Every structure is written in structure tokens, then in C-alpha cells.
Design a protein around this ligand. Structure first.
Ligand SMILES: [Mn+2]
Ligand SMILES: [Mn+2]
Ligand SMILES: [Mn+2]
Ligand SMILES: [Mn+2]
Lengths: 345, 345, 327, 327
């Protein structure tokens, strides 16, 4: 009887909360952000006025939540509908690379050596890729290594090699860039800039990639949560570049039977939450040659936008992932199985 | 020149190591095991005779390895070729349940409620399963719960309900048994005894299941390694029962977007290492209704021997997994998608 | 600006008064609120704000777990062989991983008694990853432990692995241990909860704090409140150690529950070289006890051969504890 | 039995003599050995045994990492603002999570100086999960920190997030911090290795010990050996804490490397109620220092609002450290 009226005190709060929120954004316009001093000044006034029944600490918590809500109204704050989210843009993003519309429903395959070692080595792989009618190649010029004494990659010379081979065999180049200063130079040699797992939270590198007009392949961090992975993509897109391809490549767990644990569920999670295409790297996730094909099949069936695997003409002598890379005859058998699976329309 | 002869000291060691190994097994026959006292007595004699160049600690380590190797020669020790391994038996194990040869290459599907709540509730699910031409049903009479105050299951009465419904609708029953004393009673009510994730290393329960003639569905532990999972299956098979179906159901990781992380790579790993069929539980791994179908598709494409998912006539009122279980119309849509996928031959 | 700011400040006061008045009165409903939402916030934000407002109401306005301090504020003290575990003075539990023979266990017992210590741990039933590794002597092992207990005056802690063995164990042990792999063997927990005997409950390989507390509740809900919790490391990606000792579990559990908390330094780290440092950390963080393994001839042990301290190593370890002034 | 046993015993001696003689001589090859295998062991076992025999040979028969004790046995001491970090006396580093203003940082500095402490930590560049959360004041923040350092006489520790900023930072900080998320930002590590300035390297979110050591090696391989390692918790399934403080990392790193090792108790646990207990554990396990956050008004802080101690809380925390006798 009396608690029917407490129902209208709710309509009064909504009106009050909404009106206040509008005024605060007006103050933002008249001026031009975080202001802890103003927040404390507001809290002092509110708490001084508290006559109960709530204790000061409870009142402070409630108002903080109200203030926090206001931040999302800011033009530049997309916390409530991330630019990379379907909440922001419902339609799938198509990232076109060498005429291939990545994300359009037809899966793409990216093969290539772990590390660029020589012109002849990359050419041998490009020849086998072209022979299958494929159009992309991946190759590491800059290699993130656990130890500084392991092969770091050929650097710029590796990118030059990749460009030479690609220009001749008609392939698009995907290669990793490891520091902000190298992004500008990379534009003349690659078709897609890869940001590696270990750099997924190298924020200045993400921002740098967000300021150029070039597709970015962002690999999930070794132990990144889906939220963090989406957040990293937002760093790129918030600078202007929306041409982002996400890549699942396994996460770190207690399991020793595999190098990492392929998190296949990330594909449908990311395709639901974001509008960005999602690929799966079957080589670096499992770290096992005998699992490349089964994992590739799982990836395609779960509707990944693409699959990446490593191929090297003589894996025995490779400067990285010697036991994981497929040789040319193995690559032929792998591809014949993919062709026979009917998983690619 | 002189190190060509050190090559023949190798042939002498093999002969000596082999002859010794044979004598020790003869001692085992003449007698009838672990004997730390004899090991120390042997080590005292060996170390007393050490004139170098190795230090006593190094000599002790080498002989321990030699002694350790001898253990595998014991008849009852299968450490080097586990009974569940392909090294022991190359051919796939087929586990026949209600006329279905699980493991023969044709995937099977197991649907049913998380918990058995009443005759009518289970019957409603059995009716939808039978309508699709399916032949198995799963239902929890004993429910392992984090809190003792959550619904523990109906117990024996739940098994009686399952039997009644199954006998009428022609379905085979899969249900979890949680303690050794309950295995004997279960034989009259179930077609497959399930050992849950939390009991994967309840060894006395495994041994008890190994002493009866009834198919066992062994779920992988929350954080079990593949080695531990295979070891658990060996506890069952070492007692005589080789009718074991392995079930991947996700592993515990830092990720919060899912309840557990489905480890899809476990399927091809287990199918390579062992001769046992392997199923995937898509409900308990992801803990998310929107991921059941994608995960089921991945499971089938990676050649799992079966898929398990939960169905409840009114999930809102369910006593467990209320948000994860599919209702009857959802189950129809799920099944129609499976039928349309061509992933089941 | 001053103008708009003073209006915002007045609106702030209006909200306080409006919120508190409503609270006084209140002292399903979101459906009608959202219907009146006309911006600038989206429905989800509006809803999140009112839920915080309703939650506040439960400030000054019986389902506590039995093992929680909410249920019982005072510390639980479990007295074993005369030692009041949980009273503020840490206890030390040493002993071999596996019971292998009477002579072996007696050698460790002698060394324990020599230090004025009163407890011994020894495994008669050993859970093993592989069925082909030593499984324990079983009942014979319990009988050995009871003989040693009668002879050396030490209280025995030993693992029980199945519900039926709980009743059998009562005649042989002073504390029943439930191993990490059985932390969610719920029928075993209920069996342990039905007897009048202290239980040492080890955290599961990957058990959360909530799950560990829940497991203890299974035991106490059957009637047995003499429960000692044991942190023994958690499973992680790190390979330098067997498990990752989670030292933070001690103060967390001491705050949330009234149960004593011990730390097993051998099974957590799996490294002899880390036993002393981890024992010092456990004592400093106020654990109620430390457990470590000691064997007269570790090289030939049937379990944890590289992790167990021999008798001379045990003497050095103990002398270091006495010199640390951490007790 | 006696008969067969004495033969086995003689065969044992024959192996010792045969093995040692071969070793004396030795002082690809498995291919020929297996060819002669005729049982009872399978080839895999035979091969595993000879590999152990060949390995032994490398007993009494230059590629050590620069950061390893194998390279340099003596402890590295890093002196900052007159304090010799790593000399056996633990140091304490307090300060706010983010630099928000001069007045804010100065308030904490005053409290630090009042205790006779000499270091302060403050983030001018803040790595954040979301690009919409406060990113730090940047260069302005470094300038504030240097002003406070000149005024209160404290050495400044602050995070640098990109290679270009390493050189800029030299004029403002006494120690450059490399954050957990950048532990494998290899170009940043190399940049830090090319300057003459102490570096505080935080363990990555899920970095292994090996990886952490490797990261330190990137720095030292460029010439800079003034590296302080910082354990700050590792990512696990546990939700009761932000991260799992891995206390075992301290003695492991102190044994493997010659570099000092600190523990950040705020970022590991993410819980104000665990700061003191974890600091006591870190001191007892012999960490070279402890780091914790202090803010004059945590409720309004732009990062870690619930984790930072206010000034009165900092006083209680410090008084407890002084009363513990753990220093
Ligand atoms: Mn690679
Ligand atoms: Mn369920
Ligand atoms: Mn042990
Ligand atoms: Mn902080």
C-alpha cells in the first residue's frame, strides 16, 4: 500500500540522474578527461549533507558509480560499445588483402616459413604456395626469441627478400613488426603487419599500427583473456585503423603435451562479440606437426576466417621451429587433405 | 684410432646389462615388487668398489637408472606399453552400447538432463531423443557439487527413474557413480557408468570400475594432464575392464569468458596415443549455450567418437546448469544444424 | 562554469535526499524503471545503477557456512597428542612420504622425538599417477604407524583414500589426511565428517579457495569440526617447481574461516633446495604449522626420492628453524 | 637365491669397472649399439640407458648467461640514492600507482621522507587493459617526479613503455621500470640495456622463470648489468586474488642469478588486506626489497583505487613492519 509510492521515487531518480548527466556533459562542452580533485570536492559536499540512513562509505560508493557512469557519455569514450564490437557496428568487417576479402565467409590460408633465412628458401615455399593457387605468404624477418642469443631474424634485409619473392610469385606478404619505429618502413614491404603474441600489450606499438592505413594481424597474447585481446584491438581501432584481423594461436596452460593449448572456443566468442575476422595459427598453438591437420579441420568447421601454418623447404636446418614446420611434400599431403575435406566452399 | 675400440666397450655393456636383467627376472621367478633394502645393499657394494673416475654420486645415479629399467620387464608392470596404449594394442577399441559400436568411425550423440529431477522431466527428454532416432540418454542421479548445500541428486531413486524411462523409450543409460560401494548396485540400472571429472583420480573408484563388466565413461579431471588422464584409464584397464570411453570436457584455465577451456587438441592426441574412443562434452566444457553448436561442429570435424550435450524440458527450474541446458525447441534447432552439416556420415 | 557546477552540486544533494528517503521507506522492479528511460544513458547503464542502489539497502537490513568466521568468530583449536594446533604457536609435522617398513619409520620417529617434536606423518595409502608405482602397504602400513606411535609417543597423521577405510583408520591414526586428489571425493569427505577424529584436508591440485572452503563444509556439515586445512601448492604453467606454493591462501583462509591452516613445503615446491625458505615464509605469514618430508635413505625411497630430506639434512633444517626466531 | 644374487652382485661390479674404463678412454654412436640389441629390453630403454652413461662423462670433462651465478658468483649490488639494493638489507619502495598531480605525489613523498625512507615509485606512463582508462600524464608526469625528487631527496622509480622514451627518462628517473606487459618487448629491453641506469624488470603476467632470466639477459647483453628483478604475481585460475604471488620465485632467482630480487605486494595480490602478510613473507624469504602503493586519497585514484593504502593506513603498515623485527 505504502510501497507502491516508493515505486514512483524510482521514476524521480531516473529523471534526476538523467538531468544531472546532461548538465555534466554540458560542462564538458563549455570547457574542453579525469578530475580527481573535483570528484573529491563533490564527495565532501555530499557526505557533509548525509543525515542517514546510509553510512558515509555506502553513500560514497553509490555516487562513485553515478560519476563513473557519466564517463561513457563522453564522445571519445567507447567503453560501453567498443569500436571493434558488434554493438558499435553490426556488419562483419571485410579486410581485403591481395584481392582476397578476408572475413567474407570463404576461409583463407596463410603458409610460409617461420623465419626468412634466404631468397632461395623463401622462393621454394612461394613456388609451392603459388602452385596451389594460394595468394598469401607469411615470413618472419623479426623474430621474438626467449633468449637474446637465438636467431633474431634478418631484419630489414628479411623484408626486402620477402618483397622480392612476393613481387615475382604474386603473393601478399604478412610479416611481424616488433617496435613502433619500424611500422613506417614496413609499409613499403608488407601487405599485412603482424603484431606478435608477446607484443599484444605493447600499447605504443598498437597505437602506431592504428595510425597507418595497412591491415594488421593481431595475435592473442600468451595468457591474454578475451577481454584483453578485444581491448588490444581497440587500441588499434581507436587511432583510426579498422583493418584488423584477430589471430588465435593457443594460450599458456599447465599442459605439457602441447606447446600451448589451442582455445578453439575463442573463434565463435570473438565472431559474436566483435565484427573482426578471426584466424587460427595451428603451428604455434600446438607446436606439433601431427596436430596441424586435425586442428586446421576444427578451425574451418568452427567457421574461422582463416588458417595459418608453417612450411619450410628443409626444416632440419631451420633457425626456428625446426620440428614444427612442414616440408614441401608434407605440405602437399596437408593441402590434399584440406581439399578433400569439403570444409572450404 | 684408439676411440674405435671404445666402440666395442659399448657392445660389452649391452651384453652385460642384458644378461644381468635376465638373471634378476629369474630371481623374481624363483621367489614370487619393490625392495629398497636390497637396492641399498647393492649400492653399498658397488660404491665400495668405485675407484673412479666417476664420483660415488654419479655412479649411484647410473645404477639406479639400470635398476629402474629392470622394473618394466616384470609381467605385471606395463609402464613401457600401457594396456590402454596403441603400443600395447594397435587396433581401435569398439565399445558397444545398446547396439551402437562406439569408436567404429561413426560419431554418437548423448543427450539428456544435467540432473534427474522426476519421471516426467526425464521422459520429456527421452521422447525428443527417440523422435530423432537416437539411442542413448545421460542423466545425473548423483551430482558432485561444490557446496554440500546444493542439490546432490536423487541417488538410487534417480537411477530407478532412468531405468524406467529408458526401458520404455529404448535408450541406453549413461549415469555417474560417485563411490566404490555404488558400482555393484549401478550394474542393474545403467548401460554405461560415468566417472566424473572430480573423481578422475579417485583411484579406489577407478579400480572398482575396473573389476566389473560394464562400459565406463571416464571424464578428464579439471586440471588433469593427458598423461594423468591416460594413467587413470590404465587403473581401470589393469583390473580387467577394457571397455573405456574417454571424455574431454574442458580444462581449468585463467579464462573467464568460459567456464572451462575446451581442449580440442586432446582428441587427436588421445586417439593417437590410446586405442580408446574419445568423446567431447560441449556443455560442461564451455558452460555456454551459444557455444554448444560451434563446439560440437569442431568436435565432429576433429573426428571425435561422440558428442554430449544437455537438454531439459524447462531449464529455468532445473536444479543444476539452468542456463546451459537446451530446452526442447532449442534441441530441435541444434539437431537440425547437426543434420545439415554433413559432419556425420 | 560556476553556474553549471553549483547546479550539479545541488542535483547531487537532491539525489542523496531522494535516495535516503526511498531507503527509509523500503526499510521485477527494474522492468518499470527502464520503461521510463529516455536518455542519455542506455538501458544497461540505468539498470546497473539501480541494482547498486537496491544493494545498498541491505546495509542495516543465518546461511553462513559452518566453517566461516561469520558462523564462529573464535579460532578453532585442534589438540593432537597434547599440542593445540591453531592456538598461535606453529606446529611441525615431519615424516616419510611412504611407509616402507617399521625400521624406516622408526628411524625418522627417533629423530623427531630427539627434537622434542610430537607428530609424525607417513603414507600407508599412496595415490599415484601410474597404477604401476608403489601404492602403499595399506592396512599393514597403518599398523606400523600405530606401533611407532605407541613406542615413540608421537601422534600419527596418515592419508585415507576411500570411505570404508575411515572407520578402520580410527584405531591407528590421530589425524586422518584427505589428499589433494581426493579434495572433491565428496563421499569420502562426508565419511570423514561422521567420525570424531581430526581431519587434515589438503587443497586440490587446482582447487579455488571457494572450493576448498566448500570441501571443508562437507566435513563440518556432518558433525566434525576438527578440520585442519593444508596449502600444498597449486597447478600452474611454471615448470621450475612441481606446483606453485600459493602463500596468499594462508591469510585468506585465516580471515574467511576459523580453521587452522598448515603449509606443506615438500609437495608444493617439489624441491629440496626450497624447503627452508618456504618454511620461513609460511612461519612469517602466520601459518599454524609446516609439514615436510624426512626419510632415512631418500635415494632408495618408493616415492618423492629427490624431495625428501635425509636425517643429517633434517638436523640442519631444524637447526636453521631454531636459529631463525620465527617460532 | 643366494647363488643368483651373488652373480648379480658380481655383474654389478663388472659394470662399474667396464663403465669407468670406458669413461677413462673417452676422456651417432647409439646407432651401432641398438643394432646389437637382442633383448630383453626394447630399443627405447637400451637407448635411454646409454644416454645416461654418456651424460655422466661430462662430469670432470663459457656459454653461461651473464645474469647467472655461473658467470658471476658475487651478488650484484645496485646503489640508488645512496641505498645499496642487494647487499642483504631489504629496501622499501612506496608511492602512488599513477602520478596524477604534483600535490598528490608530494603528499606521499612527505610521508615517505618522514619514515627515513629514500625511494619513491610513481607511474607517468600507465599500461591499461582499455584505451579509455587513464594512460598517465607522460612526460609531464616525469617532470613532476623529478621536482619531487629534488625537493624531498628521494630516488625515483618510474615505468617507461617505449624504446624512444628510455633516453628521455634518463634526466628524470633514478631507476627505469619495465612493466610486466613489456617483459618480452625485446626492443625496449635492448634500449634499457644500452644506457647507464638501473632497470627494475617486472616478471611478465605468465612468464616462466627461464623467460624472466632470458629477458634480464637481453638487458645485460647490451652492457647494462644494473638490473633489479621484481616478482609481482603470476596469472592463474584463482579469482580470490588478482594474481598468485609466487613467493618461490625469490629463492629460485637468488640461486640462479646474481641480481637483486624485489616483491611487489600490491600488484600481485590486488588486495589491501593481504599487503602486510605478503610483505612479511617476502622479508622472511630474504627478498632484497618490497614494493607497495600509497595514495593520499585512494577512493578518487585513477588506477588501483581499492588497492592503494591511504596515508594513515601507510603509517599503520610501516609501524607493523618496524615491530616485526623482520628487517
Ligand atoms: Mn614458427
Ligand atoms: Mn550439466
Ligand atoms: Mn611426498
Ligand atoms: Mn598499482
Amino acid at each position: 500500500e505504502l510501497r507502491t509510492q516508493v515505486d514512483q521515487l524510482n521514476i524521480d531518480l531516473l529523471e534526476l540522474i538523467s538531468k544531472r548527466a546532461n548538465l555534466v556533459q554540458e560542462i564538458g562542452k563549455i570547457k574542453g578527461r579525469f578530475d580527481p580533485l573535483r570528484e573529491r570536492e563533490m564527495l565532501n559536499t555530499i557526505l557533509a549533507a548525509n543525515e542517514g540512513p546510509f553510512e558515509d562509505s555506502t553513500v560514497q560508493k553509490l555516487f562513485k558509480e553515478i560519476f563513473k557512469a557519466g564517463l561513457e557519455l563522453q564522445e571519445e569514450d567507447h567503453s560501453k560499445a567498443l569500436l571493434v564490437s558488434r554493438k558499435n557496428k553490426k556488419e562483419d568487417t571485410i579486410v581485403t588483402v591481395k584481392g582476397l576479402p578476408i572475413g567474407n565467409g570463404e576461409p583463407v590460408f596463410v603458409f610460409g616459413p617461420c623465419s626468412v633465412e634466404s631468397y632461395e628458401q623463401v622462393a621454394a615455399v612461394a613456388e609451392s604456395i603459388k602452385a596451389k593457387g594460394l595468394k598469401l605468404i607469411r615470413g618472419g624477418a623479426f623474430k621474438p626469441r626467449t633468449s637474446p642469443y637465438d636467431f633474431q631474424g634478418l631484419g630489414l634485409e628479411g623484408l626486402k627478400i620477402l618483397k622480392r619473392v612476393s613481387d615475382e610469385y604474386g603473393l601478399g606478404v604478412i610479416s611481424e613488426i616488433v617496435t613502433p619505429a619500424d611500422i613506417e618502413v614496413a609499409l613499403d614491404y608488407v601487405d599485412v603487419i603482424q603484431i606478435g603474441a608477446r607484443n599484444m600489450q605493447n600499447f605504443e606499438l598498437l597505437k602506431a599500427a592504428g595510425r597507418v592505413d595497412k591491415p594488421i594481424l593481431l595475435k592473442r597474447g600468451l595468457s591474454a583473456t578475451i577481454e584483453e585481446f578485444i581491448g588490444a584491438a581497440e587500441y588499434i581501432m581507436s587511432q583510426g585503423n579498422g583493418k584488423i584481423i584477430l589471430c588465435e594461436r593457443g594460450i599458456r596452460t599447465y599442459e605439457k603435451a602441447t606447446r600451448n593449448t589451442l582455445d578453439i572456443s575463442a573463434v565463435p566468442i570473438l565472431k559474436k562479440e566483435t565484427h573482426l575476422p578471426v584466424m587460427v595459427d595451428v603451428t604455434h598453438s600446438t607446436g606439433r606437426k601431427d596436430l596441424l591437420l586435425p586442428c586446421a579441420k576444427a578451425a574451418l568447421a568452427i567457421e574461422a576466417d582463416g588458417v595459418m601454418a608453417e612450411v619450410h623447404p628443409d626444416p632440419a636446418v631451420a633457425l626456428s621451429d625446426s620440428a614444427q614446420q612442414m616440408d614441401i611434400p608434407e605440405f602437399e599431403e596437408f593441402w590434399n587433405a584440406i581439399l578433400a575435406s569439403n570444409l572450404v566452399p
